[PDB]
Peroxisome proliferator-activated receptor delta (Homo sapiens), 88 residues
Amino acid sequence: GSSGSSGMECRVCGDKASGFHYGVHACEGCKGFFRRTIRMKLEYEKCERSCKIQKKNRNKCQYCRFQKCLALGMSHNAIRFGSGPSSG
Ligand SMILES: [Zn+2]
Ligand SMILES: [Zn+2]
């Protein structure tokens, strides 16, 4: 098909977006990564190369990926909302 598209598309990678997520319309894939990096509080080394998160190559760079999310304006102080009761 590879035909045109009439709707919303991810802002991180580009692939069709699932909907409004953290202010930015991200897809299931990207979204997952972001949240994960938060809930897990994982860190990454500064990637000077400043790779470019694209659909064809999404799982290319980690740092850049997480960065792009922040640049777009991904709300980090939102993850904490309606969650299962876990050992506090
Ligand atoms: Zn995406
Ligand atoms: Zn990179």
